[PDB]
Amino acid sequence: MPSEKTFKQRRTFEQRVEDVRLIREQHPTKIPVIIERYKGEKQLPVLDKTKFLVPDHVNMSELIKIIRRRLQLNANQAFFLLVNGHSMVSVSTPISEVYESEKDEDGFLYMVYASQETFG
Fold first, then answer.
1. What sign does the dihedral 51-1-85-18 (CA atoms) show?
2. Structural domains in the chain (count)
3. Beta sheet of 30-37, edge-to-edge order
4. Which of 2, 3, 60, 85 could form a disulfide bond with 91, CB atoms 3.0-4.6 angstroms apart?
């Protein structure tokens, strides 16, 4: 059992763009998201999911709140997220504008998580 590849290495760009077509057709007023494990912090195993939709009227806090239930822990255990593998864990910006500022080549809010805040 290898299981050591990311969504960009597993799915092709066209396949990822094809998924955005259905996400906007079904949810024209929502924001798609693609979060995976951070390369610098490889402690947490593969999450239950890699792509999840989010309401455009929500903020980073609601997105982090969903990742808590997506994972099996809480704020006391460990919760650190960052975009492009080069950011901190900030929460307050509305996903509506945060997505437009952190979109991806295929149209997805690419981000990564970690169980700590140390460097490599």
1. negative
2. 1
3. 51-55, 30-37, 109-114, 80-82
4. 60
Residue 23 is classified by DSSP as H
- Under 8 Å CB-to-CB from 1, ≥6 apart: which residues? none
C-alpha 99 chain-centroid distance: 11
User: What is the extent of the structural domain holding 35?
Assistant: 1-120
On whether the CB atoms of residues 81 and 35 are closer than 8 A, the answer is: yes
By what method was this entry solved?
NMR
Supply 109's token pair.
Answer: 């809010």
Residue whose structure tokens are 């990822």: 16
Provide the 8-state DSSP code for 72.
T
* DSSP SS3 for 91: coil
CATH number, domain of 77, equals 3.10.20.90
Q: Which residues, in sequence order, are bridge partners of residue 80? A: 114
Rounded distance between C-alpha atoms, residue 86 and residue 79, angstroms: 16
In this structure, what token pair is assigned to residue 104? 């991806």
DSSP secondary structure string for all residues of 26-69: H-TTEEEEEEEE-SS---S---S-SEEEEETT-BHHHHHHHHHH
